[PDB]
Amino acid sequence: MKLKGKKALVIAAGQGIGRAIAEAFQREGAEVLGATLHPEKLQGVVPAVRLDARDKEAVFRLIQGLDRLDVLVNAQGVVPVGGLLEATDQDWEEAFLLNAKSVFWAMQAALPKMAAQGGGSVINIASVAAFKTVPGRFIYSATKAALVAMTKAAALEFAPKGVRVNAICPGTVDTPSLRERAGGEEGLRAFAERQLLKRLGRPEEIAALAVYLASDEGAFATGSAFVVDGGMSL
Amino acid sequence: MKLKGKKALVIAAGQGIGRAIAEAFQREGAEVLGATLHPEKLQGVVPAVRLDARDKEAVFRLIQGLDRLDVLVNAQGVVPVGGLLEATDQDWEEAFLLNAKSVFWAMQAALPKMAAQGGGSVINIASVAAFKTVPGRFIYSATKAALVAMTKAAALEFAPKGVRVNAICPGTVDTPSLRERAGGEEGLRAFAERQLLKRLGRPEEIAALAVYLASDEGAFATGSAFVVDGGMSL
Amino acid sequence: MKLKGKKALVIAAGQGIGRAIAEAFQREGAEVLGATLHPEKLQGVVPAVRLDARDKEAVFRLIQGLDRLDVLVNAQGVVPVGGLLEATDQDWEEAFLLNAKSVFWAMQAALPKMAAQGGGSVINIASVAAFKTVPGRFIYSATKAALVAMTKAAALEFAPKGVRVNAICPGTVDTPSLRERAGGEEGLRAFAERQLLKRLGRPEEIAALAVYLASDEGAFATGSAFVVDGGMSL
Amino acid sequence: MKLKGKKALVIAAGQGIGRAIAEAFQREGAEVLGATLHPEKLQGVVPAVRLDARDKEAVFRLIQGLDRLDVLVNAQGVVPVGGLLEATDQDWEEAFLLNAKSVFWAMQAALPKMAAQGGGSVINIASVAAFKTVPGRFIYSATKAALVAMTKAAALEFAPKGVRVNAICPGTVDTPSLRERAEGLRAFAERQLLKRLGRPEEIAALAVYLASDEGAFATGSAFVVDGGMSL
Ligand SMILES: [Cl-]
Secondary structure: OOOOOOEEEOOOOOOEEEEEEEEHHOOOEEEEEEEOOOHHOOOOOEEEEEOOOOOOOHHHHHHOOOOOOOOEOOOOOOOOOOOOOOOOOOHHHHHHHHHHHHHHHHHHHHHHHHOOOOOOOEEEEOOOHHHOOOOEEHHHHHHHHHHHHHHHHHHHHHHHEEEEEEEEEOOOOOOOOHHHHOHHHHHHHHHHHHOOOOOOOHHHHOOOHHHHOOOOOOOOOOEEEEOOOOOOOO | OOOOOOEEEEEOOOOOOHHHHHHHHHHHHHHHEEEEEEEEOOOOOEEEOOOOOOHHHHHHHHHHHOOOOOOEEEEOOOOOOOOOOOHHHHHHHHHHHHHHHHHHHHHHHHHHHHHHHOOOEEEEEOOHHHHHOOOHHHHHHHHHHHHHHHHHHHHHHHHHEEEEEEEEEEEEEEHHHHHHHHHHHHHHHHHOOOOOOOOOEEEEHHHHHHHHHHHHHHHOOOOOOOEOOOOOOO | OOOOOOOEEEOOOHHHHHHHHHHHHHOOEEEEEEEEHHHHOOOHOOEEEOOOOOHHHHHHHHOOOOOOOOOOOOOOOOOOEOOOOOHHHHHHHHHHHEEEEEHHHHEHHHHHHHHOOOOOEEEEEHHHHOOOOOOOOOHHHHHHHHHHHHHHHHHHHHHOEEEEEEEEEEOOOOHHHHHHOOOOOOOOHHHHHOOOOOEEEOOOHHHHHHHHHHOOHHHHOOOOOOOOOOOOEE | OOOOOOEEEOOOOOOOOHHHHHHHHHHOEEEEEEEEEOOHHOOOOOOEOOOOOOOOOHHHHHOOOOOOOEEEEEOOOOOEEOOOOOOOOHHHHHHHHHHHHHHHHHHHHHHHHHHHOOEEEEEEOOOOOHHOOOOOOOHHHHHHHHHHHHHHHHHHHHHHHHHEEEEEEOOOOOHHHEEEEEEEOOHHOOOOOOOOOOOOHHHHHHHHHOOHHOOOOOOOEEEEEEEOOOO
């Protein structure tokens, strides 16, 4: 319905938000390719290709190899944990690489391609951590603030070329990566109890917003950072 | 099919964004009640009722008279024109009454009722003027900043009761009221030429986002202000 | 030394933050006039004039009657308390009148005057409530968000004239009116203990920032909102 | 009189905003040490030491070697130019190292020390580019947004220990680096609302407030001083 005739690439489509967005896009009629470290995770759900988003050459090769790209979703990311003194140089470099530099490359590859094919939509999954300080997320927040600034910079520069660039900034969403950090879904029951809404977000809730941004009806949004966080940053 | 179960009330559903939202809500399966000063405009389009949002008793009577209310959309508003010295006390009183005070009343009426029924979704149509300073919008900008603050306050307070409260913040959208502002359709191209995208927003672009926020998929968004402004605040 | 040869008007200079600003201004060499409902509180401290900031005519008459005005400080304000359903129309009208409309009037009177003399500085005392949602401040936060938007709108309009307009956004500051709504000392003390810094802000901490903004060294700040809130909005 | 008896370290104190801050601190009574790649620029005027802020070991050694430290200013930085496609990975690495990672290190060294010795004030010189998008500043904007996020994170974590952490976010300030980037200045001043560039002294006076006892209620703040350019 809403994405028929659109060609989409979703980076880190193997699980969680990335996967939910790939599945939602396909449901709305998009031709979707899910790039991920573990394409077997997508066996029989969405077309998939192996991609390590840390690999610049592979990111440029994949995007430049596509015939047409209408929507690019950057869902790749890692959540280092720790306050200022717990954080290490290795945390810093790993997180800035995957959370921000990877997206830099993907946009470098995709935006000219898109501009030269008329237009497009780029959707970066950031985090509410870009705006809201919480304990033990020193490195993570810095990477995500960088990502939002980059989203807006790209949006301004390519607006005259028909390419929209936006970020979605989720709060705490129940994902496989969250479960392994918090120890299963009843590990999650504790923190879900602390939320205002007494529950955690769903990947589907984030995917539906991405569908909007990818759609023809999302075409007047650019340079925006959409917070979906259950009121946690209030 | 995103709203098939839901009862929605749209205040100022007669034209522009409010009407686009009402029509879109209708298309997505919702039972819509359109309140407006001119109910004839919704004849054969959406069920309607006559309402002057400046009248506190009328606002409370309408909302408290409803059996069940799943979605409330506050699309009422006036756009006074002028810088600081051109602005009058009459502009101030009229704009704060309609743009802000009437929403205060609508929310006072609706949020307890929604709280009791287990949840719901309130959507305030604010403006990017709440965040982005532009010339000749002194009063308008103050009212819309007030409105976003109220949106967040209500969101925090009723999040435990499962009632979401969010704002959409449009940029320059082609509406009957903008056209009357611009002195006619002839005055629109000047506005469009100032836009990064070289075109004005479409009310449908705002409506699609309201559908997301009214839907079950929007249930993790609360206290957010969604900017859809064609990049103008970059 | 820092405000030598400056003429300053402080509205609501009779107590709290307003008084600290007037005293600090005078210490730094400015000629100061403290306008207040209660001029008796300033005798033998700063030159004083009776002024009810709710009275539009009186506000214009005082400001237009001054020979030269280099600095205007709007420190007037009231803090109603309550959530959405506790808040009243009385609260709304009173708070919007004093916190926002009176500043509208004062800037209408002052800014063209300052613009004609080639520069000046307007300092509005807003609140971190303009940005940060806290329980029980529904009306207050709305009025202060309005005030910050007005600050920026005026700043943009009069920047080419060399007149700066800025807001200081304090957190919880120890003032007679805070103690009037807390108790006097005992808690009061309870609230202080619970704060991040385990103390309330001092009026002098806001006043020193006001000195910067009023001074020639503050001439490159305009349209800014300076948060001084003991970290409470983090 | 605003900083009597305070001991301050200013990193990249050799020119521009860092230099103005070091001189202002001294006029306000502080004992100042200016650290810089070019201490010869400060000599006779401000006590100075050579420091390359890119060298992690050097940063920790200087800071942990100080007797006492009441105020730390991170004024180090670089402004790469270019849009998305112009920007290079080398631009990225060099700007994130100096603009952000070196501040990470300086705070890791200084904050625990301050916490154990009666608190203090850390002032990071960011940029209004952290908030306001302008053409040709893709990398720069990313680094300064990271820096503001870091400022707020550190401020929350160390508020309970008497340490304040704040950022000043300048607009376009007349500095030797700007002049080299750009007479030249004129064309860039014409397209400013105030029809002129910021002065380093205008930033420095705000740093004095933040460093002072009267600035102690500010923490986690990002103070914009940009001539209205982000309006
Ligand atoms: Cl008073």
